[PDB]
Structure 1
Amino acid sequence: QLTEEQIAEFKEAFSLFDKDGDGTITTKELGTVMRSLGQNPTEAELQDMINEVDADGNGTIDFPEFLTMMARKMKDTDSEEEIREAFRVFDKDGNGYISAAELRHVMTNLGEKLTDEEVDEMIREADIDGDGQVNYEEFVQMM
């Protein structure tokens, strides 16, 4: 019942949390992500919450189990809604087209230092439409 590109988007989302590449999310592997988002978990809390998703009981959820928890929730339109949610908040200009000037300004938040000029070389690649200023449609091309 799950639509084919959704699993493919669930593929990459699964790999976004499966750093080691074996298809198994260990508690420590999941735990480091939650510190990276600011929350400070106890080991028991992580291991408790990981049990409910684990239908097999092996202690590490595989992708078939991962789909079931993904199917648990309504991601009916949340995917492109989040895509538009980012395009709205990245649109600091508010013109409806996102300039490249603040593209370096938000990617610095994670700690990247890529040069100012080179991104608008990459936004030009994004701007196959050639806008010179990225919109949601370019973001849809990006994603």
Structure 2
Amino acid sequence: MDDIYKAAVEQLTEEQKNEFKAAFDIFVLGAEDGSISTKELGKVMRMLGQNPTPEELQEMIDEVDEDGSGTVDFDEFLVMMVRSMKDDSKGKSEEELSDLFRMFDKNADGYIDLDELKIMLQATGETITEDDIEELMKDGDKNNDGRIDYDEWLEFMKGVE
């Protein structure tokens, strides 16, 4: 029975909502609609000022909203436990694309280059080859041309891990 969250609730106490409500109220100090970052560990880990890594985690969670509501409710977080998303959640934002697009266009040509896009993974410690990225850009296309434009960068993250 139950879909996925209605099942755990059977063996889970709703009282927990108030348990993790403290750390939440302190995190949404500035958020009026409870808009905050889900990254709990990544926050305390990056707070130490260590190597880059969690910086990207803030992006995926930035637009974790899959239902497209605008914010995440306290309850929505609880149900996220039983399911255990483990990792990942999203990639880049709608309004952010307008910035990232030009942020990667270091060639000032209007399009995106391999050394430009791949340059990102170059500063993080990825676990892939340098030439491998060459295959990624190939998919970046969308308007049929062979390069990135003011539209492909958006559809780019159509669903890549």
Under TM normalisation by the shorter chain, which class is it? 0.3 to 0.5
Name the structure with the higher helix share: 1
> Looking at both structures, which has the greater relative contact order when contacts are Cα pairs under 8 Å and sequence separation is at least 6?
2
TM-score, normalising length: structure 2: 0.42
